[PDB]
Amino acid sequence: NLPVRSFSEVCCAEARAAIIQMENNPDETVCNRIWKIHRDLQSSDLTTTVQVMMVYRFISKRVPEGCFAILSGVNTGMYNPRELKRSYVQSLSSGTSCEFLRSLDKLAKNLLAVHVCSDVKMSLNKRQVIDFISGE
């Protein structure tokens, strides 16, 4: 009975224009262009780009082309993404991702998102994507 908010209602302001555009016109070609623009913009920082990426992944149901490139400005060798993602998968299965995501700092969350989006077999529902982006 609880409405699902839109992604554009919960994302950060900087990601909002891109997310509106993808939600309004979920054509694969259009969404791929929007993703590729924000991927490449140094002017959208990591968290902003990750929210655009998460919504692209959800709407397109495709791996976002080249998404690992958005980690070019950060050192990520101090975490273990394979382990983070296995834990995240578990939390999704038990309905506790919101609480689990509290255990990650900002970089860990963003790193996790890139790894999640690169995996064509993960299929978050809208609420789980909303959990992720509103948790940032």
Automatic annotation (TrEMBL):
It comes from the Viruses. Residues 1-136 form the Matrix/matrix long N-terminal domain. This is Matrix protein. The chain holds residues 4 to 139 of 312 of the full protein.
